[PDB]
Amino acid sequence: NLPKARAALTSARTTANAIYCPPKLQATLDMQSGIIHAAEEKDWKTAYSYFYEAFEGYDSIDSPKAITSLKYMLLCKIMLNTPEDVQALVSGKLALRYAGRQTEALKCVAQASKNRSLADFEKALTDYRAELRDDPIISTHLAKLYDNLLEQNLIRVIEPFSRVQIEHISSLIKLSKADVERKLSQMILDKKFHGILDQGEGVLIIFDEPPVDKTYEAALETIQNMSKVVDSLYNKAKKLT
């Protein structure tokens, strides 16, 4: 229940400064802000920073609580795939302080973030399935990943040659008409992909001529030129009568 969790988080906002010292609240409040907002899909890198700020407050607390705490933050590095904070965290003394079993399995999970590599990703997906169960939201984490990795693999095969047949290139992605080809059509709507397909002969042809410096810089000024005359129409009509 997300609205109930926000109401529970809202009650923690006024309770943080209510008593004298939290003693630890805002550290957990920022962690709770990195959960509900993570389900709200507000922002990734900032929510990942809340797991980093909470990890700084996790120093000298119950180890069974800190051994499952790295399950959330290191899998968050898997969701983002571009946190840019990788080298900062994992190279520090605080992230490497845990030598235990489960965290060593998370050490290669944090390495799997630097891995990507679909063929490797589909493999470690089964090896890390034990850590997949502790994922708070299993759908949102791996769906955006695999959907982002889709077009990451799509831009690789379409790049070398301009036009591509859609029957052979879809055999690598295992299907054509159901979803994939509709996802490539959505990339045209998002401008990430420039090209057009052919349903009859099954060939995707990429063609682009984006720049036009003659039409755009002209018509915009002519429309502005109308505003120059319309504003002068007040001078014209008033001086005559």
Partner 1 sequence: GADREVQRILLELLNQMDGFDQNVNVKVIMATNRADTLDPALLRPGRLDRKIEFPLPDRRQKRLIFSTITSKMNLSEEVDLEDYVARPDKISGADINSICQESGMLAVRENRYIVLAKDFEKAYKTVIKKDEQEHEFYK
Partner 2 sequence: ERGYSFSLTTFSPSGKLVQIEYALAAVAGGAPSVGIKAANGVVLATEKKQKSILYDERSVHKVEPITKHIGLVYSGMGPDYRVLVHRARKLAQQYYLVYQEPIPTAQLVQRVASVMQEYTQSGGVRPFGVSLLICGWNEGRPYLFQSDPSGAYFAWKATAMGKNYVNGKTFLEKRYNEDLELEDAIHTAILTLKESFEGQMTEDNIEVGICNEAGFRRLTPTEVKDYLAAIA
**Which residues contribute to the site for partner 1 (CB under 8 A)?**
91-94
Q: Which of 20, 161, 207, 234 binds partner 2 (CB under 8 A)?
A: 20
Q: Which is nearer to partner 1, 93 or 214 (CB)?
A: 93
Q: 53-92 mask for partner 2 (x: CB under 8 A)?
A: -------x--------------------------------
| Between 56 and 208, CB nearer to partner 2 | 56
How many binding residues for partner 2 (CB under 8 A)? 4
Of 55 and 128, nearer to partner 1 (C-beta) is 55
Cα–Cα distance, 33 to 9 (Å, whole number): 8
In whole angstroms, what is the distance from residue 164 CA to residue 139 CA?
Answer: 32
Closest distance between partner 1 and the C-beta of residue 67, in Å? 21
In whole angstroms, the minimum distance from the beta carbon of 94 to partner 1 comes to: 7
In angstroms, give the least distance from the CB of 89 to partner 2: 22
User: Which positions from 21 through 50 interact with partner 2, judged by CB under 8 A?
Assistant: 21, 23
β-partners of residue 204 are 164
Q: Which is nearer to partner 1, 47 or 95 (CB)?
A: 95
